[PDB]
Design an enzyme around this catalytic site. Structure first.
Site, mmCIF file in Angstrom:
data_model
loop_
_atom_site.group_PDB
_atom_site.id
_atom_site.type_symbol
_atom_site.label_atom_id
_atom_site.label_comp_id
_atom_site.label_asym_id
_atom_site.label_seq_id
_atom_site.Cartn_x
_atom_site.Cartn_y
_atom_site.Cartn_z
ATOM 1 N N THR A 239 0.987 -1.214 -0.096
ATOM 2 C CA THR A 239 0.166 -0.041 -0.017
ATOM 3 C C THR A 239 0.926 1.219 -0.016
ATOM 4 O OG1 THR A 239 -1.814 -1.092 1.284
ATOM 5 C CG2 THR A 239 -1.957 1.227 1.167
ATOM 6 N N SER A 282 -6.388 1.017 0.150
ATOM 7 C CA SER A 282 -6.666 -0.045 0.703
ATOM 8 C C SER A 282 -7.872 0.040 1.119
ATOM 9 C CB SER A 282 -5.689 -0.203 1.998
ATOM 10 O OG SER A 282 -5.596 -1.153 2.953
#
Ligand code: HEM
Ligand SMILES: [Br-]
Ligand SMILES: [Br-]
Length: 399
Positions: A239, A282
């Site tokens: 991420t 995310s």
């Protein structure tokens, strides 16, 4: 019922469905890869509720859990770490590693984070783009977060490179089944050897703290220690690498802001805050299964039914953020927390460390490379599959 995860409306934008649902069906049902149904929450208010309600569980062995992939249903068999726990076990374990990620602890990491970014940026400049452009991801977006979390865990300088590469191969989409398997294994073996080493002579790292304060006193065993360390490595690294690449690409989509930022690095903080809200890299981590019947919006979620709360949609809720779909680094923030890092007890353990890394990248990258630009048309950018979390595989640049 439609299949979820939905597909992004386009390379950089979220799924077109979200806005639709937020206006017509804020809580609806969706079909998961294995045919099972789950409840999809899209409003900010409702997402916060889901992430904090004590009637919802994160335990994946409980039936009805909304798994979104084949690897997920299989990773649910292993001994669970705190990411998959509920109170009191959740905080009982999370507390073992939280100390390293506190605001204060992160503030003191700054010079280290800065030296890390500074060093990679220089290894880059020294590399040069004489014969053509270079991948910003492989040369920068990837090493920055990787080197930091590995160093925090306890990996010595000389090993950061290879391991950084192994962890990448691990999640690369073009990697073959056996390629991904060997890399995953390699990471675990290394982490296991580290625990054996810090049990003998401890050092200044997360693994040594678990060894010294948990393994020895008998609060957890060797394998438990290796799995906790592994979690911290895989839970936010991909991420981070994406937020970084998406950040550079976002600044190239708005030369206006890129100016205001190059003109004042001290704006990085609020730019990162807008990057984390705009680009929710995310958006499939806030999932639960009802422990008992619970009512959300106009729907009744019966016990043991799965729930997926989209923080990506909530971050575009026009009922919280004005002009949600417009990237405004000077954005006038409301009183409601953007959900890029989740909400409630489970809010990302490394939220301050992520922001610190991002703020340090965007407050130093263009100041060392002001003539840095993306060497490909903005419409030929290699984004991640439309049906997966938003990100970017490779980003060629020149400086
Ligand atoms: C900018 C990058 C990052 C973003 C946007 C991100 C976002 C998130 C999100 C959405 C969650 C779900 C929280 C919830 O349950 O509501 C999460 C959980 C978590 N993240 Fe991060 N994360 C990032 C970086 C990191 C990093 C660097 C690490 C590694 C230290 C990390 C480790 C974890 C862990 C361990 C959890 C589980 C916490 C718990 O359930 O108690 N994250 N993160
Ligand atoms: Br990596
Ligand atoms: Br999420």
């Amino acid at each position: 019922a439609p299949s979820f995860p939905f597909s992004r409306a386009s390379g950089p934008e979220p799924p077109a469905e979200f806005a639709k649902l937020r206006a017509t069906n804020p809580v609806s049902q969706v079909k998961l890869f294995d045919g099972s149904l789950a409840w999809l929450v899209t409003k900010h208010k409702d997402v916060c509720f889901v992430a904090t309600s004590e009637k919802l569980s994160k335990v994946r062995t409980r039936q009805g859990f909304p798994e979104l992939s084949a690897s997920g249903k299989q990773a649910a068999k292993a001994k669970p770490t705190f990411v998959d726990m509920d109170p009191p076990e959740h905080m009982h374990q999370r507390s073992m590693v939280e100390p390293t990620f506190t605001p204060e602890a992160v503030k003191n990491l700054q010079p280290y984070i800065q030296r890390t970014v500074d060093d990679l940026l220089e290894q880059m400049k020294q590399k040069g783009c004489a014969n053509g452009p270079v991948d910003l991801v492989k040369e920068f977006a990837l090493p920055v977060p990787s080197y930091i979390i590995y160093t925090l865990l306890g990996v010595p300088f000389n090993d950061l490179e290879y391991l950084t590469q192994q962890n990448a191969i691990r999640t690369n989409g073009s990697s073959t089944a056996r390629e991904a398997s060997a890399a995953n294994q390699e990471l675990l073996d290394y982490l296991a050897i580290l625990v054996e080493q810090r049990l003998v002579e401890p050092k200044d790292d997360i693994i040594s703290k678990l060894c010294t304060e948990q393994v020895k006193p008998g609060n957890i065993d060797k394998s438990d220690a290796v799995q906790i360390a592994f979690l911290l490595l895989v839970a936010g690294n991909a991420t981070m690498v994406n937020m970084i690449a998406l950040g550079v690409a976002t600044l190239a989509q708005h030369p206006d802001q890129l100016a205001q930022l190059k003109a004042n690095p001290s704006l990085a903080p609020q730019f990162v805050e807008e990057l984390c809200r705009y680009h929710t890299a995310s958006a499939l981590a806030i999932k639960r299964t009802a422990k008992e019947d619970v009512m959300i919006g106009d729907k009744l979620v019966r016990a043991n039914e799965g729930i997926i709360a989209s923080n990506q949609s909530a971050n575009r809720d026009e009922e919280v953020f004005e002009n949600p779909d417009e990237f405004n680094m000077n954005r006038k923030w409301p009183p409601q927390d953007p959900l890029g890092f989740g909400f409630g007890d489970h809010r990302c353990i490394a939220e301050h460390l992520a922001k610190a890394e991002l703020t340090t990248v965007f407050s130093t990258l263009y100041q060392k490379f002001p003539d840095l630009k993306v060497a490909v048309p903005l419409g030929k950018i290699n984004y991640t599959p439309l049906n997966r979390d938003v990100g970017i595989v490779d980003l060629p640049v020149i400086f």
